[PDB]
Design a protein around this ligand. Structure first.
Ligand code: HEC
Ligand code: HEC
Lengths: 126, 126
């Protein structure tokens, strides 16, 4: 869907910005600093689910640019493992949200965050 | 979810960028320049549905900035009519996609596009 590599870069950066907001806005809730409304969180995690599937198709070959490290492309398999594993942590977060299980939500939220950082430390430029 | 108005601006711009890509990538399909795969289009319009609900909550009072015209805030009701009407055009597009009805998809796509432009001509800076 991208006319030039720059369009893929802009798309993925925008998608990642939106995940970050839908993930990070729950921090006060998981810390207990803001109240826990199970329905609110269920709905927000559904949005996050949708968004978390979107970036990867915008790292399609030849789309070097942005702050993407080149290693995304020279080992397609390891990067794919990374994103698929991240998405499966999102599945655990969805399960916790759908169950209205706060304890499970806290644990899943931490594991998701660790997954974000694991990818950045291998694949995003400093 | 925004610490400063700039964060709302960045969110909405990113959300709008993603809609634009999920909307515009269907142009070749509705023109017949690319093939019509009903399942592909159904799935893409579901993504567009999700995305098309997101920008509006990031124009929450005091978030002047970006290329948003000030009139978004001085008449909350007219802007709301605009976004809600846009979202209902998205509903028609979803119905057409879910039905696998190409003719309906073409018509709905044009009406969605007109709705985007109607909002821009009142509420986005040139
Ligand atoms: C690899 C499998 C990743 C996972 C999982 C997550 N992110 Fe990431 N992110 C990744 C790359 C390669 C990049 C650079 C993209 C580019 O081309 O520049 C990024 C970038 C971001 C950004 C900045 C986006 C921008 O505006 O430029 C943010 C805010 C971000 N990532 C957030 C984020 C969060 C919160 C994640 C887990 C919920 C997450 N990312 C996962 C690679 C990967
Ligand atoms: C009002 C109800 C709108 C409707 C419907 C659509 N858009 Fe729009 N758009 C609107 C505003 C007020 C702005 C400015 C936002 C800001 O603070 O700068 C925009 C902007 C965009 C952009 C640019 C985003 C960026 O990267 O800065 C794009 C690509 C865009 N809009 C696309 C777009 C499409 C394709 C729409 C219909 C499918 C659509 N918008 C509807 C207001 C409104």
């Amino acid at each position: 869907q991208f006319a030039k590599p720059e369009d893929a870069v802009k798309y993925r950066q925008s998608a990642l910005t939106l995940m970050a907001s839908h993930f990070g806005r729950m921090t006060p809730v998981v810390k207990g600093q803001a109240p826990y409304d199970a329905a609110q969180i269920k709905a927000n995690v559904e949005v996050l689910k949708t968004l978390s599937a979107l970036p990867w198709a915008a790292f399609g070959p030849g789309t070097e640019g942005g702050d993407a490290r080149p290693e995304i492309w020279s080992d397609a398999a390891s990067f794919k493992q990374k994103q698929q594993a991240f998405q499966d942590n999102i599945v655990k977060l969805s399960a916790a949200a759908d169950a209205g299980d706060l304890d499970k939500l806290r644990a899943a939220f931490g594991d998701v965050g660790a997954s974000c950082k694991a990818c950045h430390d291998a694949y995003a430029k400093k």
